[PDB]
Amino acid sequence: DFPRSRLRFKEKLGEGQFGEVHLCEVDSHPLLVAVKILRPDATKNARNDFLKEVKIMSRLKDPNIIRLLGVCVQDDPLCMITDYMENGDLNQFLSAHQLEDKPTISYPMLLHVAAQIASGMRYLATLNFVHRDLATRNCLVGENFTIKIADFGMSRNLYAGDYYRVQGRAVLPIRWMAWECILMGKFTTASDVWAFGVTLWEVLMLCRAQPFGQLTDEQVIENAGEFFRDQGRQVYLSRPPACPQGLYELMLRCWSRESEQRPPFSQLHRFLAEDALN
Ligand SMILES: O=C(NCc1cccnc1)Nc1ccccc1Cl
DSSP, X not given: OOOGGGEEEEEEEEEOSSEEEEEEEEOOOOEEEEEEEEOTTOOHHHHHHHXXXXXXXXXXXXXXXXXXXXXXXXXXXXXXEEEOOTTOBHHHHHHTOEEOOOOEEOHHHHHHHHHHHHHHHHHHHHTTOOOSOOSGGGEEEOSSSOEEEOOOSTHHHHTGGGSBOOTTSOOBOGGGSOHHXXXXXXXXXXXXXXXXXXXXXXXXXXXXXOTTTTSOHHHHHXXXXXXXXXXXXXXXXXXXXXXXXXXXXXXXXXXXXXXXXXXXXXXXXXXXXXXXXX
């Protein structure tokens, strides 16, 4: 519950802020798991953060959310054990595919991927859990095209350009952030909805471009001010070439100026699983 000696470390999968993820083998033939441990330079602050993440993760029980399989909080060394997701994060996965003409992925499959994210988010909503960093870099692919939402410390490292860093401030995914988050730092379910729109845009781009990729960080922050001013000078992500107009309009609703006018995840799921099929 759970004995450490049964873990055979295989390869480093990546490195976060207080943690590090390795592929491991379990001997009771061989089961593969992903194991998050403290980094070698871990401090007391890191240990505390690790213990809090166990607490948060122990609550989360849904098919489309990362699952905690097992733990060491018992005796050190600390670890979290989760499912090994053979196909990596969603960003890597989609980047390695092209859209089917007429390794490939179909448009109905992109919808299925996005519907699974929406369902994960619907679960989190019911718990009044705000994610704060929804993006494809934070989703895992298991196949048979199983998507699980996670929150990786390591995302901040391998996707450094996706985060706006000022000394003494929190590290902010500004390109995925609702205008009111950029201007006020008020993170809500409604700002998760906005980030879901951006995430959906990424899925439809097959992760080929950063959101507002031709614009600087400052222009992105200035753009949020334009939402606030509401003088019809705000700018939006363009329609992906794979995206039909009806699906684009769903994205646009995620990006409503008013929080309350953004669709709940129940509705987003329904649209992506049913309405989008026509
Ligand atoms: O995904 C999360 N942690 C990365 C991890 C953990 C264990 C093994 N491998 C990776 N956490 C997480 C997920 C959803 C909401 C909040 C958090 Cl903090």
